């Protein structure tokens, strides 16, 4: 809206109440929208036996299509926006403006790949609260989107040439961060819940679990085939909840033509790390904490007292 002349402001995308606010908003949206037939949540607050909370309810088959949310200033506050295209997420921004509201953000709940988001204006950008810490998530922001087309028939398609170029751009940025002499290796998820081991998303109201091994199986800047990458997918009914610890069960699909097409606009990665005298770094798809999803869009905004 209005650019602030000669102003320097500190931003911290990792400690941003806007992220927390959005998180609670999306949890609320999901409660009134995508209702499961059964939900289970543990309760072991007592000293002895546990008491799993079981809810059984009507579970209508509904289409689920994320709609843009605009966050405007909450009473008593203003929204500041960092305009620097290489802003690393934490520190002084010297090109700052006040805005009435954020851009339109689609609250896509997914793991591994960030879909239908905003692209970096200039070069690919990678962000972490602490790059040296292998347990902290690396948020990748692409500057060029890659189509991923999925069907309820059990697969997702990605153009191999486009993905190849994307990985090259990401690996270049990772080298910039971890060392220009380092080999950059992508590998499949090392394990955990099905929702974070696969590329997990919802399409046509259904929960997809796509095996992403083929996307993360390459070695870059080391020595010196199919036009389409086809990822096998499963639609599942018993789902681990992202909103809190628990499980939900949904009814089977009723549509024989479930088709989605999203743009991959970012990734969530983790680095293996560990003690090694080896000039190579291993990166695996990650995610699971949807706050990182919201962060990928809200990193450039901050709310301040007026």
């Amino acid at each position: 809206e209005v650019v602030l002349v000669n102003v320097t402001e500190n931003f911290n995308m990792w400690k941003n109440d806007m992220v927390e606010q959005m998180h609670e908003d999306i949890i609320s949206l999901w409660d009134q929208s995508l209702k499961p037939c059964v939900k289970l949540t543990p309760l072991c607050v007592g000293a002895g036996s546990c008491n799993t909370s079981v809810i059984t309810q009507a579970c209508p088959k509904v289409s689920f299509e994320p709609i843009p949310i605009h966050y405007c200033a909450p009473a008593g506050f203003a929204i500041l926006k960092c305009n620097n295209c290489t802003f690393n997420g934490t520190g002084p921004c010297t090109n700052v403006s006040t805005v009435q509201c954020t851009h339109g953000i689609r609250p896509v709940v997914s793991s591994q790949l960030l879909l239908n988001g905003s692209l970096a204006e200039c070069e690919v950008v990678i962000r972490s609260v602490n790059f040296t810490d292998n347990a902290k998530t690396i948020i990748v922001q692409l500057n060029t989107s890659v189509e991923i087309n999925c069907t309820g028939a059990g697969h997702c398609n990605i153009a191999r040439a486009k993905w190849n170029n994307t990985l090259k751009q990401i690996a270049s940025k990772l080298r910039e961060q971890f060392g220009n002499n380092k080999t950059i290796i992508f590998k499949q998820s090392s394990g955990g819940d099905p929702e974070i081991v696969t590329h997990w998303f919802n399409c046509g109201g259904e929960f997809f679990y796509c095996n992403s091994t083929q996307l993360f199986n390459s070695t870059w800047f080391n020595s010196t085939g199919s036009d389409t990458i086809t990822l096998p997918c499963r639609i599942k009914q018993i789902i681990n909840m992202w909103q809190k610890v628990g499980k939900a069960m949904y009814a089977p699909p009723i549509s024989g033509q479930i088709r989605c097409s999203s743009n991959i606009t970012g990734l969530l990665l983790t680095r293996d790390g560990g003690n090694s005298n080896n000039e190579s770094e291993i990166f695996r798809p990650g995610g699971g904490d949807m706050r990182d999803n919201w962060r990928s869009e809200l990193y450039k905004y901050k709310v301040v007292k007026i």
Binding site: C37, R234, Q237, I238, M249, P252
Partner: peptide
């Protein structure tokens, strides 16, 4: 395959 999250109920 309920152990793999498939459930027809």
């Amino acid at each position: 395959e309920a152990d793999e999250g498939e459930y027809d109920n």
